[PDB]
Amino acid sequence: EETERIVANHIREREGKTKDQVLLLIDIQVSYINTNHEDFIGFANAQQRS
């Protein structure tokens, strides 16, 4: 009982922090949208994209 309790508790504490970081990571992606990524830009649409 007590073991399940403490571990289950810890999970919920970790639940918060991991979710926050997951959200934040996606938010970071929207804030800046890099165009210099090599896999991104073919340039003139097709005929250059792999």
Binding site: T35, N36, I41
Partner: protein, 48 residues
């Protein structure tokens, strides 16, 4: 030469020429433009 006839010369001969006379100094102008396009973009990237 009459006054009014001269006015026609002012409008249709002088004015155009005064305009033509102000040199572009294009090489220095092109620099201005290139600097200008980098500044609008700047902190953003590329196309278009």
């Amino acid at each position: 030469l009459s006054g009014g006839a001269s006015i026609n010369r002012i409008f249709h001969e002088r004015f155009p020429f005064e305009i033509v006379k102000m040199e572009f100094n294009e090489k220095e102008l092109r620099r201005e433009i290139s600097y200008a396009i980098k500044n609008i973009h700047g902190i953003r990237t590329g196309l278009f």
